[PDB]
């Protein structure tokens, strides 16, 4: 429960989110997460690279935008986007209960950029370019 605990101490202000991997909870941050404020480890960098823009037969992305996994997910209704966010990531990073309330424009498409501890990066489009 490493990611849960690290996020718990972000909220308690004992830790900076930029110092944790927001995907897996590794403290071995190698990089800035290109979409959201928070760190990312190398293993998750490779996951992101490998999983990015893989699609399921439903026409929505196969893997959660934050963690690269997920079963039950929220799916973006912006057809230029088609991203998914798993319910566990949403409840962890936005806050408890936030997944079932969301159940839609996703966190990348919404007007607001801040949702709980989840904060969209202003230069995200050009960060992905750098990332890839
Ligand atoms: Zn990681
Ligand atoms: Zn996830
Ligand atoms: Zn979207």
From Swiss-Prot:
UniProt disease annotation: Tatton-Brown-Rahman syndrome: An overgrowth syndrome characterized by a distinctive facial appearance, tall stature and intellectual disability. Facial gestalt is characterized by a round face, heavy horizontal eyebrows and narrow palpebral fissures. Less common features include atrial septal defects, seizures, umbilical hernia, and scoliosis.
Protein name (Swiss-Prot/TrEMBL): DNA (cytosine-5)-methyltransferase 3A
Entry's free-text remark on domains: The PWWP domain is essential for targeting to pericentric heterochromatin. It specifically recognizes and binds trimethylated 'Lys-36' of histone H3 (H3K36me3).
Zinc finger (PHD-type): 61-113
Positions of the ADD domain: 9-132
Gene: DNMT3A
Interaction with the PRC2/EED-EZH2 complex: region residues: 21-109
Phylogenetic placement of the source organism: Eukaryota, Metazoa, Chordata, Craniata, Vertebrata
Species the sequence originates in: Homo sapiens (Human)
Effect of residue 56 to N: In TBRS; uncertain significance
Subunit structure: Heterotetramer composed of 1 DNMT3A homodimer and 2 DNMT3L subunits (DNMT3L-DNMT3A-DNMT3A-DNMT3L). Interacts with UBC9, PIAS1 and PIAS2. Binds the ZBTB18 transcriptional repressor. Interacts with SETDB1. Associates with HDAC1 through its ADD domain. Interacts with UHRF1. Interacts with DNMT1 and DNMT3B. Interacts with the PRC2/EED-EZH2 complex. Interacts with MPHOSPH8. Interacts with histone H3 that is not methylated at 'Lys-4' (H3K4). Interacts with SPOCD1.
Function: Required for genome-wide de novo methylation and is essential for the establishment of DNA methylation patterns during development. DNA methylation is coordinated with methylation of histones. It modifies DNA in a non-processive manner and also methylates non-CpG sites. May preferentially methylate DNA linker between 2 nucleosomal cores and is inhibited by histone H1. Plays a role in paternal and maternal imprinting. Required for methylation of most imprinted loci in germ cells. Acts as a transcriptional corepressor for ZBTB18.
PTM characteristics: Sumoylated; sumoylation disrupts the ability to interact with histone deacetylases (HDAC1 and HDAC2) and repress transcription.
Resulting phenotype, residue 75 to K: In TBRS; somatic mutation
Tissue-specific expression: Highly expressed in fetal tissues, skeletal muscle, heart, peripheral blood mononuclear cells, kidney, and at lower levels in placenta, brain, liver, colon, spleen, small intestine and lung.
Annotated zinc fingers (GATA-type), start-end: 20-50
Cell location: Nucleus; Chromosome; Cytoplasm
Family classification: Belongs to the class I-like SAM-binding methyltransferase superfamily. C5-methyltransferase family.
């Amino acid at each position: 429960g490493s990611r849960e605990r690290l996020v718990y101490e972000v909220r308690q202000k004992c830790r900076n989110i930029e110092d944790i991997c927001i995907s897996c909870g590794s403290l071995n941050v190698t990089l800035e997460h290109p979409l959201f404020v928070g760190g990312m480890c190398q293993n998750c960098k490779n996951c992101f690279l490998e999983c990015a823009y893989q699609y399921d037969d439903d026409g929505y992305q196969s893997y959660c935008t934050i963690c690269c996994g997920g079963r039950e997910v929220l799916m973006c209704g912006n057809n230029n986007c088609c991203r998914c966010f798993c319910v566990e990531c949403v409840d962890l990073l936005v806050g408890p209960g936030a997944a079932q309330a969301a159940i839609w424009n996703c966190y990348m498409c919404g007007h607001k950029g801040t949702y709980g501890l989840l904060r969209r990066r202003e230069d995200w489009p050009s960060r992905l370019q750098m990332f890839f």
